[model samples]
Target chain A: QDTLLTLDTPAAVIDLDRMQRNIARMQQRMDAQGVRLRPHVKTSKSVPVAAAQRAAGASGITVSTLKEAEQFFAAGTTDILYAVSMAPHRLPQALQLRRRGCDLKLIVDSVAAAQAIAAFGREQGEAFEVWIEIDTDGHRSGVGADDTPLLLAIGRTLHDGGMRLGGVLTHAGSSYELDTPEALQALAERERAGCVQAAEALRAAGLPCPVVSVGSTPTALAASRLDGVTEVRAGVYVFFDLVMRNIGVCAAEDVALSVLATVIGHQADKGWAIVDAGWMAMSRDRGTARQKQDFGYGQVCDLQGRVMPGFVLTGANQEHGILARADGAAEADIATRFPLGTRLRILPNAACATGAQFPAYQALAADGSVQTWERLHGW
Target chain B: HHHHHHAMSMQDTLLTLDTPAAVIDLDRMQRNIARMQQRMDAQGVRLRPHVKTSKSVPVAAAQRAAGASGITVSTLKEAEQFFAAGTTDILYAVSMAPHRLPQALQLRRRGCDLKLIVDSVAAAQAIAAFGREQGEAFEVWIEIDTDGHRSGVGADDTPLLLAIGRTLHDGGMRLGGVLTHAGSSYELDTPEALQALAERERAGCVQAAEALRAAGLPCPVVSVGSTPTALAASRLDGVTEVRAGVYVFFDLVMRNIGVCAAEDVALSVLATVIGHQADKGWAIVDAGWMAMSRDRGTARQKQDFGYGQVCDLQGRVMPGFVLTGANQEHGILARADGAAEADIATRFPLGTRLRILPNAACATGAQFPAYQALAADGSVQTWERLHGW
Candidate 1:
């Protein structure tokens, strides 16, 4: 009788059926586009989820930290692209993983980082595979795609210093802020073009460029054509959250990850049903706050994962969530509506951030059976 | 020189222990513990250090050694962990859920003096009936709504308090007084405002206890607290015990509230400067929202320290610099005034280690498996923390 109703309150629950569909949709979209789907494993950080993606034709994996690379590599996936720029101190940890027979690739956006990687590889007598990051949309990190001199300098630092110049990659992370497909598609094309141009620039400067990777969840799906892109990388697609839903990429029903909470008490006057799940359970990621439609902390749902429209988690403490109307209107019958001990599900605002809040996920299948899937944390 | 070895070892520990690690300043922590304990001692009320902030046995043990009588917890798992670590007197602070009774019963049966709280008759009845079925007189406390904050019944609601009190008394359970938390005290910045709220919290909880006693119900313990109120209150009056967490490791939010100074903050995230965005005067660090946590508790305060306030490796505050923006694994460090640091690259070069004071210590500390307790002699010890319910 291991079901959502019987499980403990404030637990991370995943709809396996919804998750499998999400995995298939993204993988198939990449398949038809003729680009290798190196699904970013930072979303789940669980071995089975990444394995499911690989089972669905994800050629390699993309990681945000070296901890992720080490975890996934130990889980038997070799091909990894550490997406974050290389830190000098972490080069040794990266080197240790590569020596263990994993096809690990490092990325850098500056010549100083590239020179550090080259110097470390030379000192250790190991040629590490490295990629140059391109800033396609000025979102976060990376050298500008138009900064040819810096790109060539980074490429030469790795190439001349006896390391593998893998290729160039870009992630238009700003795509997450868009709501329409037109804007997303434009960013996707720019990401693809910028990454491909960086690769072309490196090749033109007498350096080897083998791969050109570009993507973000929104861009990967809105992209009608990835003309010069060899691989696409995206996370949060496997467990699309409320932020993605408001961004028009996924529906409310498509969000696979949710927090199973139980109503413990009520502030009837304020129309608040205090649940056991709070910021600790739902995380403090209010990503949709600035979006057109803001889901305060998360979207409320029934035990069967049906959306309870207009009801959202309005406020959260360390271990208590205030469930009320999204429009701030009080339901005087809040106590009767959600009585004590009522079990409910909350769709998180950000999937990746919320998913990391738990030690493991209670995955529910269509047959009402539940399985505990362990998740990795920390660097 | 003798100082050379100490400096080199300290540098080595800070350099190679891994990025995004939770570091606890033992000296500052002991000072914070002593500061709170001395105040409680002068007030003549017992201090029950809420273990929810640190959730570490050693942290609780330090408080207990410094004169704390018992411990308060927010989760049953913390109770079980602390009880297993030789702490017997425990109070589960959150309102008791009916379904979690079995777990609480199991802990009590194993010789742990675990107390539960309830603000409604439904929870009180649930506790009473379950205690009767299990042949145990559970110690139950009525939660009073002192500051009209999160949970609890109104302190002036004598009828409801008596009903909840009588339910436990009639059902053969121990009516263990009343307790409250003036959580709204965190919103105030001035000592005068904090003192007023503290007095309100004290008078309200005392009123609830008097009502219970006037009704011929045995009320032994009267507990009231919150980090700000516990420190700001001038007199305990009828209050018997005080519970305060986060005082063990003051955070930026507490500093903004004027409870503790920035240097008094004990918990910090050790991060490594990975790269730099030169034009924007931003140095990307490895500790992002994942390591520092997504708690933006200080965003609306007088001074918004985005993400967290930046400090040097030795926990010295680097004025005008903060984590302005953060991603999952990347944090953007720049001048707080948005002025570009022309030598951002040289100021915090690649591989430079820095410490970030988190917005909320409880949330940030939970992100890690254990804490590296940094001692005064430039030494470190790993203290395990209880994670997940």
Candidate 2:
């Protein structure tokens, strides 16, 4: 009885068959590349999704928030990495997780943060495991990989203050902007070499540097070899999106996450079929707008998860999505094409953002059965 | 009520709350409600606050307690939820879908004065047949297109409007009235333009109602509103009630529209300084798109506020600084002028708590399950929010 036709509209739906294949493909690629696959759970934020990744040979997990670490840890993941730089106020939470026997490794990009972490660890009487975040692509946060003095200062601040230096980590988030395979491969190499250089710099400074981590979904999949990297982390690959499809890393069919919406009404004159899933269901992540290909809000698909070419979600209000032609021409027969009560699938521009809009995901199996997978919401 | 108990004795300060928390200033919210209700009262038009803005019982209760006649909802789930909470007079604003008629019937059958809207003859036909089969007379309103911004039947298209009205009335359904929302009011920034558009919305809906009545159909209610129009309209000669949403928690978009000021924004995301990109003059906060929402409603406005406007923990504006960029859980805070503050760490040291005003409060408030109501005495209580349809 739990099928797409029966489920509520404006729901997050996942193809379990496609998800398993995605998980296996990533784990197999990491295994062949000779590195530990640490799948970032921030994308799904669901325990069962992470469980499948772990079941497929992913080593540990990476998190962007302390709430994620808390939930995943309670779900039986011990080796967890808080990828975001640690704030001093959050050190108390890190300490609590550590005290409860969670191998919660924290990251730092500045000497000020390193000093704060060290002071807090000393005051709390706990030797925390901390990692130095290296900036390889200058896309977002992290210190420059070539900034030897700053890296050494941070490493020594933590080392001298009696905290465990876990290693060095870098995420080539800029890889999301690249489209060609050559460019993706080149960025992967840069990500790997820069992170390795930072690790060697710490070792050269007489500080313990045991781990070297670097990756983004595009780079992790494009890299031919993982020579110096001990672990690779990628989040959105398990649920590829229109953004990923535009990046040329995955096919449109490989996308496992989509929004299940019901056709509520139609603007037959304007060639628009209004659906129940609006910007509230699919997040306002117009990531594909400036990309090589603009999928509008998302690529329109049928209930069977087949991509309907030349159709895109052109516009959205709070509770309504306008499904129109991609070329901006009006299809006068829009009402007949998608009549009222017709069920449709919408592949969002970004999986992480779209998934976060719903309270849970309806994981559909090959037999057309759906199981509700609860996801963690809010901080 | 979901109450978060902090360990610190200085419980009066926002420092006790966790990072990336959705906060509502009770004082400012009450003031916004009073301002809107007073305006509607002066015009002699009943106010129907759109619950889609707050999605919280307490927030709607505040509007109702301040003299709002009824509530407006975008989804039927809101109708069921609010009806269970004792709000019977509800208007499901979106055009009626044939599939959802059963759920609508269930609500009306349970003693709810639920009203549905329709813009096409097909929808009217579906509602009529369904109502006749169920032996229930459902009240349906005709949606009028005033500004050509979104869904509705043309106000002057008397033939089409009469057809929809007759289809419902002859099919044994109560023809409630007509309503229109000048959603385009958000695009205009001047008072003259907003007032003009507000009048257009009112006049168009009133004309459509008169057309339906002239065709021997019962048209009792004439509703029209949008946050900008409801506040800018100088007169409502024929409109009986006004409906508006975003005015409840006015965001940066509303401020840019000249409807509300920055200080009038009641909702803000409480974030902590997690890290700093000193060379870039960026302080990374724990609140990102996930907390503040990805609604960039002010991107094309007169003045772009980047991701959001920054304020001190006590809610004082930090001019020239804004969240220029944001990741999933990391927001890059820097001067809007792109100048690097060399001593960024020293200025906003780690563990610093700041409040960020979102571009759209309706979208931002959806990211949280509950809102932390902050009072003048610094005490905070949680009010639960409705999530998915």
Candidate 3:
């Protein structure tokens, strides 16, 4: 398959031109912010994509799983940040990575986690660099910024135990729920202030809190300033998805990742053209359902990567996707419209989730040539 | 780690594993296999278990040992996997794509008893033309639409059915049989409703077979099923065989479908409590959508398990506890009534392991590469499953 036009269906295709633009645009914005940008690699889990971000001036990398850390570290990278709260049992592996002279930083949102890290480091006679996660929004894991007592206590747990208290990091994940520019800016401010406040609390306690970090895809692009922030980390922006598009950041055409599918069969009466791309290919992510515009499984696109109005994958099974109009009305001659064996592209709801379903991506270049890029999986 | 004459002790093996792992209760699974196979025996129809549920070769081998005729696969990869394991009779059940014909033909030419399915005239013509050009006789089945939930030519579309059959029969391809799946049986909860759908599935598929035969086309096999219908049906008069995947590892969805009880679910994700939100009473576990899968199949059923039903480390269901919500790597385990549990931390303290009964076993099993199958003899067997297309 020389070109993506003739390759196997139900394969992930990356539009390289759009990806380059997405990368360049984000890097310039981060450069303007006067802060280092640690591009979260959890979104793509591919070395080549991370290399693209690094080439475009990303300072470091952020990861969700340790397997991702191992993959990138082996592929060639030193400054790695494991963003998720440290699981106590994984300290041995963390110790192994750090022992190899990898500058891998771990984060913790709880005092217990901080204690676990500090104790594990003491047992191994190692001072692990640990960051405290500050909570700006009540979305997921993190310590509240206003709760200075708990925040400093967690800092003391690391500082007192001969561990490097590397400062505070916060993610305005709830910014994903907001669509307005004003609201996103406000949330971004909260994220910045919260992270900085935590750092301040640590510093006032005579403890070292040098680094301050904050971000989310929506918050990173929408923020007006990062006053006390030393670094901003964000993922999912490199391949903007439907959720990001609905959040008013990237436009539909800016989505760099899409699943190339083939029309296999049709239910003429119900106006359903079954495609080879199902939840197995698109993934079972219904992230768009709660968004402003529900694109069902995904927003359907034509062969050249142009959006086809009203058509979406309304239902999906293991190996079959039900393509129909979102209006709940019959399509105008479904077979004639998307004839059997006709190619179609679908923009996914969450790029992180959809890309996880495939083994590798067919990176379609600006010159229309396609190349396969491998991604790491499993923990 | 002490080794005896045999192998590793399995039931206590959970204490040694990393959190967020898939485990199969071999005892429960064997019991499930016996029950389904027994029912099929009473009905006098061959049971060709769908291996799409448990992509593990050992699981399919257990089903075959319990009297399964062949194996039904949803993808060509599965067909290749099972065939390599020495299972000759196979059915690639999905509507065949034109491009995949070469792969199917290659598998067939390599001495595997490979079968293909088609639901459209264009697909049938493509398979027939490809078969003639390759000088290979492909065994193709006609997909009959009993439930309008997915792809298939309608059983009542006699003209279209005959056309597809003729195109294959005359184009140097062997028209094997007609198969229908009452996929909509998943929506029914009552035994009566389930029985009716099963009979309709049989009647429709048998009718399609008769039509094909009358139209001078060979139709030897009449396959029909869906777990609920297979168990609920009184008899299979016209059906030659049945296929059901999830019954082997009945899940919360099967429980709601009125086919199995909670105790019958053999597959569960073993997760450890990692953190908690005290005020919200959410005890987050290591098992999330990635481990348990994002399939909310039970949401529309009689009862909903957000991601799964929670069970203690001993494999006993804890009434009223379910994963209320889930993210990528964290599952928020809470009470069913939305009330905070008593002492969310101590009740499910950090490192406290729990078993999460999935909403759909098939979807859950697909997330992992292997299952720590615990046999009754206290030994665990590592069952590796094939993944991807």
Candidate 4:
């Protein structure tokens, strides 16, 4: 592993030891539960990270954007779920991916979208595999699983129009709002029951609902058992973050992702150490703002990865971050304490947001060597 | 002819764009440029638009064509990119760190009118010593803290200001001038408050320059501006030039700042209605925090346009419609008060594309690789922008 000093500041660092442990932890949990884990690639968006997850017994992959699907497919990943609801304009891109023998699966929540996919599939002389998105927690986009009529309509629009109405998928994204294990478990059960119920309803109505998928990071980790769920998809667990730690799936030290920063200046009187990693590197996703502990921008740690207790990036601008005590007690000696040019690693509020800021990550291996892993960005 | 062309472009190019795209209504952007330049012309100062807002060479060229003398940048990468694009006059506006001096010095060695800013004595000494060793006459400016919002030395601290000027001049470097950004102006909405902040910024920065000059140092340029202050100030008495970035592509923050109106915003994220939460009166659009940015700059403004105000593809506001909430890649478009509106599903049908304005133009522009500029002839051209440090 390369020393932290050799790499540049404002870089995304992945602790390989912590990452493998995280991957194994999730994979083993899924194994014990008798459900396959199709790890979401949106967090790292890197082949090596996904390959590690695959090697550790991940079934396939789940992607948010079509570009992620194309990129992962290019890396020899034939099994991928283009997780977001199908955008009619993007169907052409999806069709091309499936045409390449990539078992590319598309999801839809609207009859218009399914009809568009089905019409396009018929026009292209291909039955595109499509999944139905169920709204379990009413957080974001999804069709109500309890609303059998709408679900059946969408399924029929796909199947009757010569498309493969594969199965039903649900994401308990709102489970992110909970902090307690009980709350997470309850939400996980609700997620599982809803997707399973939707699948049974589809099957009872003579629709082919073979694949039953459900997950979110909290639900995947918190679910005691997936009674009827076939696969679970979770991102961000491979490199747990402050938000996840607050959710109780992992401890604070389990966070594998951090932004390496250098102390450029300090407002000693204000107890602020200005670091080079600003919102540009840490991202503007204040996912932890409304959480139990608002880790300002991030939790500060020494270059060797020990917590610098209570110090966090309390404020940030475009290229400057204000590091100060979370308790607001002025550290008058912050200049001497941090000093100019002293490097420190700051753990992020969320892994996905932090990782999105960098073009690639500096993967620090267990042996202390470093390798640059590129990330796929954009839509 | 301009009117005819505008109508044609509005009709033809607005709907054909891909969802989650950054669209620049060129007509409005051009008007924004002319309005700012004309004000600077009246004030008898050069207008240097900060290219950080747009980061497009063509956008910078448009500003130059409208009488902008140079450009202001946030990163050294910007300086290098802009210099290679043929605009030599650039001011790296952030306080220079010791490690970045080499890049700044190298930029100057290549015949660029590159200027650097510094605040602390340690950073100043490093730049001066590096310039001495390299035998480069690096043009350096001392950043003044017009409003203690971020970096730079105190405006009234005449002693430290002179020390910095002397460090650069005596160490064989060019003490170019003093510059200040009243970034706190973004938080204001009243013209009176903006004008007051503008004059305070101008007077304080001019005072620093006067102190440096009185101490036998060359303080040739005195710069100050932000979109709000630059427009609100009746006059900039002693400033040689003004730099304002966000005005070129004003957002909801600027609209709330009283410098621009809803009709004046030139940048928008073209989005499609991807899904719906009919029970909540929300229509899901493809443009979320990823496309629109996570900048909730308008949250504290007079009118909190949640994430952003909703506009039809023709760039007209759909009053009371806004993106109430946003996830990573999804935006919840609903009424301003979160009331369940009637037939949102039918309102924003499955593929009806709409454009959503952003809270901060700079943050939103950074999310995309290129901007689709809708020209007067109903034609669209992809203008690439630079990203990352």
> Each candidate's DockQ score against the native complex?
0.73, 0.70, 0.57, 0.56
Candidates in order, interface RMSD in Å: 1.0, 1.3, 1.5, 1.5
Tens digits of per-residue lDDT, candidate 3, B207-278, equal 899999988899999999988888998878888999999999999999998999999999999998777777
For model 4, residues A93-128, the per-residue Cα lDDT tens digits are 888888998999999998989989999999999899
Q: What TM-score quantifies how close candidate 4 is to the native fold?
A: 0.96
Model 3 ranges off by over 4 Å: B1-12, B377-379
Q: What DockQ would you assign to candidate 4? A: 0.56
Error of model 3, residue B346, in angstroms: 1.5
Ranking by TM-score: 1, 2, 3, 4
lDDT agreement of model 3 with the native: 0.89
lDDT of 1 by residue, A1-379 (tens): 6988789888999898899999999988998999999999899999988988888889989998888888988889999999898888788898999899889999998888888889989999899999988999977889888999999988999999999999888989889789998898888888888898989998888999999998989999999898888999998999999999988999999999999999888887789999999898999999999898888889999998999989999999889899999989998899888878999999999999898988899989899889999989777
lDDT of each: 0.91, 0.92, 0.89, 0.88
Model 4 chain A: lowest-lDDT 10 consecutive positions: A1-10
Q: Residue A1: error of model 2 in Å?
A: 0.9
Q: What is the DockQ score of candidate 3, to 2 decimals?
A: 0.57
Highest DockQ against the true fold, candidate: 1
Task: List the TM values for chain B, per candidate.
Answer: 0.97, 0.97, 0.97, 0.95
Q: Write the per-residue lDDT of candidate 2 for residues B1-389, one digit (tens) a residue.
A: 23444444435357777888999999999999999999999999999999998899999999999999989999998999899999999999987878788899999999899999998898899999999999999999999999978788999999999999999989999999899999999899999999999999998999999998888899999999999999999999999999998998999999999999999999999999988878888888998999988899899999888889999999988998899998899999999888997889888888789999999999999999899999898889889999888
lDDT of 3 by residue, A84-198 (tens): 7777877888899989878999988778888888988998999999998887887777788798888888989999999999879988888978999999999999898888888
TM-score of 3: 0.97
**Which segments of candidate 2 are over 4 A away from where they belong?**
B1-12
